[PDB]
């Protein structure tokens, strides 16, 4: 069935560095961008909400101001990845990635930041 997959379910990053969390979803020939929906939610935050090729920033949590970004060019490959720049200690925690292209599925990624 439709299944979202993560290459790494645990990331160890360290402070003040730019990190990327990868999420892979099935794409066959050409990506139909209209059909694509991408949610990056860590816990009760919302990081990225992506529908019809637009980001709704009204629902993004303020912790992520001009910090988090979804990499677009990887999407055509069936890779929807989130890039948090300048990772702080509070960025450690469980991230969820929900995708709908055709069907829909989600996944969980735990991120540990280690201290200087």
């Amino acid at each position, epitope marked *: 069935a439709f299944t979202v997959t993560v290459p790494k379910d645990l990331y160890v990053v360290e402070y003040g560095s730019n990190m990327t969390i990868e999420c892979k979803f099935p794409v066959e020939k050409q990506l139909d961008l*209209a059909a694509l*929906i991408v949610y990056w939610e860590m816990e009760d935050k919302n990081i990225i909400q992506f529908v*019809h090729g637009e980001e709704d920033l009204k629902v993004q949590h303020s912790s992520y101001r001009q910090r988090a970004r979804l990499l677009k060019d990887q999407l055509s490959l069936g890779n929807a990845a989130l890039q948090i720049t300048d990772v702080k200690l509070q960025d450690a925690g469980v991230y969820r990635c*929900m995708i709908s292209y*055709g*069907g*829909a*599925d989600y996944k969980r990624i735990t991120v540990k930041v280690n201290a200087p």
Partner: antibody
Amino acid sequence: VQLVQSGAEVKKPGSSVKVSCKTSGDTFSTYAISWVRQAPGQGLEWMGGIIPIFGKAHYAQKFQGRVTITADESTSTAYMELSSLRSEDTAVYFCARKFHFVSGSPFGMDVWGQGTTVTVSS
Amino acid sequence: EIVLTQSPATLSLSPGERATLSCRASQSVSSYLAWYQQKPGQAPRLLIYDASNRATGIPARFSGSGSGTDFTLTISSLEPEDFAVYYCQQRSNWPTFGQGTKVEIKR
């Protein structure tokens, strides 16, 4: 895949109404269902839609306030609640699902419920 | 909102004649479009999907075409059971319908 709605209802102004929709078909939790209002002698209107596992609905800016869309994955039943009923809310309310092959938006409507008629009068 | 303008409002023809229903979009919807046939008292039924592709179970007398802003639905020979309103729907963004075109039997 099939859709079945709740029967027709008469509600007096300012009250609230909740319409039921059940999927006898393909997966429920995986695919988006939408709710559409067809006003008398009028065009169809996309109100909102939800993909049940996501657990939060999307609404049109016209219906932003009064509409509440909730998906029960347990029953594979969808609901649409219209708060603060008035007058011209009287319409034929549909729930619809996309065919997996038609592409475009996940909220596209192809398979429809038989329709729910709502009358608002004193 | 993308706005769909169907034309004409009322098409009046008779059995055996061809029919032409137009839909324009206020923006580019590319090829994401679908035509529906709604008889009174009933829910819409998909005729043409992806703007050129006819759904199975639907007569070969039905066809649609176009991409970007200009689309047309065409009925080769009007069947008595073809008379009804015909709506259209764009999926390139949040779905919007047209006003629909009502086909009347001309006698």
